[PDB]
Design an enzyme around this catalytic site. Structure first.
Site, PDB file in Angstrom:
ATOM      1  N   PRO A 110     125.649 -11.919  -2.096  1.00 58.87           N
ATOM      2  CA  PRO A 110     125.777 -12.992  -1.263  1.00 58.87           C
ATOM      3  C   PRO A 110     124.842 -14.295  -1.501  1.00 58.87           C
ATOM      4  O   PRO A 110     123.800 -14.154  -2.130  1.00 58.87           O
ATOM      5  CB  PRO A 110     125.430 -12.349   0.019  1.00 58.87           C
ATOM      6  N   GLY A 137     118.539 -16.985  -2.437  1.00 57.59           N
ATOM      7  CA  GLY A 137     117.411 -17.405  -3.399  1.00 57.59           C
ATOM      8  C   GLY A 137     117.817 -17.117  -4.901  1.00 57.59           C
ATOM      9  O   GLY A 137     117.100 -17.407  -5.917  1.00 57.59           O
ATOM     10  N   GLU A 186     126.351 -22.171 -11.515  1.00 59.51           N
ATOM     11  CA  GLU A 186     127.268 -22.346 -10.784  1.00 59.51           C
ATOM     12  C   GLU A 186     128.273 -23.540 -11.147  1.00 59.51           C
ATOM     13  O   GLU A 186     127.797 -24.487 -11.348  1.00 59.51           O
ATOM     14  CB  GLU A 186     127.077 -22.256  -9.322  1.00 59.51           C
TER      15      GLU A 186
END
Ligand SMILES: Cc1cn([C@H]2C[C@H](O)[C@]3(CO)C[C@H]23)c(=O)[nH]c1=O
Ligand SMILES: Cc1cn([C@H]2C[C@H](O)[C@]3(CO)C[C@H]23)c(=O)[nH]c1=O
Lengths: 304, 310
Positions: B12, B16, B38
């Site tokens: 999820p 961090g 990402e």
């Protein structure tokens, strides 16, 4: 270990693929119509043609159609993808040029739902080119013995034969027929270009300035401006998508079946084609019966 | 041959992950550790416009009753394709370079920001729990998950819900946070279950009404298989239609060869980093296929981070 012959009947629909396979130690994996109309979603074919039709009429936007079209193509290729993934571990290496213990004949291959339909929908303005490369990015690896029969048929005959066999929820769209015939022609040329040495990165320059010219391959479709940076270069994500495409296509063995003839002709014509097809070993002794049950269960549950 | 270590940090959002990953990258030599971030740029501009935004809007619209479940699903499915694209194409170009499993000093270490199953299983499954995706579409994505390459080490995260909520509270869908947290726990149980010899087909009937590399075998009801007991996938005799059962076989097959680890994010940023640094110790490395694979992979990651991570 036994030998297997995988033959995928594909190409544009409406030429007779269904009548050709019907007439023909040889099992069939048919059209998953029931998955399309019921198991996967409700009447998926109707949503598709209804949405194209409404885009043409100006009732919804390009963005609206693209979302429905993508979601819808996921549901269409599902049976193909799942069949390929459970079947892949049973496929071993090539035989060579003798006898096939089993002959698995499918109604279409995963690239129809992952590449060809989406590329055609792209040509119809109902799908973004980034969505088509995402689907290309997910094309399962090409295993040894991937034999794909595509069809030949003059347009007028094709429209005639298409008109009389309209699937449930389908609409007779001639722009879509042209699109799909053009993708498949590009497809056949693309395999040839790649088998012959073509390097899309080396010939890219030719789309803006012995094998088919790049302008006659599926690569021309990806010159779309949504994929290009401000300086005109293709972004790297898309270039890597085309690299996969080159790698998946290139090792497929393409076979052309003339459909301009009666179903007896088509049916024997097809069986003639199998002699230049590549066969493979299966990986376990019990690989043939599992394949047959898969084939029987698929047919029973999804092909009516 | 030279060896490679591939590590995918996932789980999820809001625990961090990104931070921890960069602290790990920071400790290394300039070229023996590369970070594949990402692909936000792809999600905001290259693949479509503001995909994340669009996904949250849709979910609120549906929650509001301003759009139907069907509307919702067309969008989430389509958005998820775009979300996973970068992960899928990267895995397909990397695949050719990965060889057999060596053992647990790599010439190159690649830390990815999530794995392809994030986009093709976890988010979709959670949207199914939120009612914005159909279980049939989720299984369509599961059938497309690419063959799990050797030495696929996945790091998932543990973080008490209250701490998590606190971090995350700077829309804030608390239902989506619970769905994604639930999905990732089932995922770790699934790998453990598959590695302990579990067979979903043998245990299917036990359905009705996390540790990934240690512990006893979890009950099927605590794995991902439970999400798929939905009436939509059931034939009129109670069993799963075979298309769906075959999708579950791929799911088992793809998760059983994976090496999952758990990172405790309930700690300081450097605490997370060292924790992670200790876990890399028991990770599976693979040989590459060519002498030139190392440099090529470095270029691949650099180019990826440059073009799509911001
Ligand atoms: C495979 C495929 C087919 N179709 C339609 C056209 C075709 O005539 C048909 C039967 O072949 C009705 C279904 C798509 O729209 N997408 C696809 O991926
Ligand atoms: C990977 C992934 C993320 N997301 C969202 C939630 C997550 O917090 C995020 C950044 O990780 C904003 C983007 C999805 O919706 N789908 C996905 O497949």
């Amino acid at each position: 270990m036994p030998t297997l012959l995988r033959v995928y009947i594909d190409g544009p629909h409406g030429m007779g693929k269904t009548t050709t396979t019907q007439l023909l130690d040889i099992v069939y994996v048919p059209e998953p119509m029931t998955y399309w109309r019921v198991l996967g979603a409700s009447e998926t074919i109707a949503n598709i043609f209804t949405t194209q039709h409404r885009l043409d009429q100006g009732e919804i936007s390009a963005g609206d159609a693209a979302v429905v079209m993508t979601s819808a193509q996921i549901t269409m290729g599902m049976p193909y993808a799942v069949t390929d993934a459970v079947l892949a571990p049973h496929i071993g290496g090539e035989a060579g040029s003798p006898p096939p213990a089993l002959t698995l004949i499918f109604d279409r291959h995963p690239i129809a739902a992952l590449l060809c339909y989406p590329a055609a929908r792209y040509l119809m303005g109902s799908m973004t080119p980034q969505a088509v490369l995402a689907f290309v990015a997910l094309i399962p690896p090409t295993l040894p013995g991937t034999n794909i029969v595509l069809g030949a048929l003059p347009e007028d005959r094709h429209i005639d034969r298409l008109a009389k066999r309209q699937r449930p929820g389908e609409r007779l769209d001639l722009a879509m027929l042209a699109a799909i015939r053009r993708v498949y022609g590009l497809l056949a040329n693309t395999v040839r270009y790649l088998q012959c040495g073509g390097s899309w990165r080396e010939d890219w320059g030719q789309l803006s300035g012995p094998r088919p010219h790049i302008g006659d391959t599926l690569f021309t479709l990806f010159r779309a401006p949504e994929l290009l940076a401000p300086n005109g270069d293709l972004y790297n994500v898309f270039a890597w998508a085309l690299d996969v495409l080159a790698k998946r296509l290139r090792s497929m063995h393409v076979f052309i079946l003339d459909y301009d003839q009666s179903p007896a002709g088509c049916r024997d014509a097809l069986l003639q084609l199998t002699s230049g097809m590549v066969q493979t070993h299966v990986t376990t002794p019990g690989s043939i019966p599992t394949i047959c049950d898969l084939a029987r269960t698929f047919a029973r549950e999804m092909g009516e």
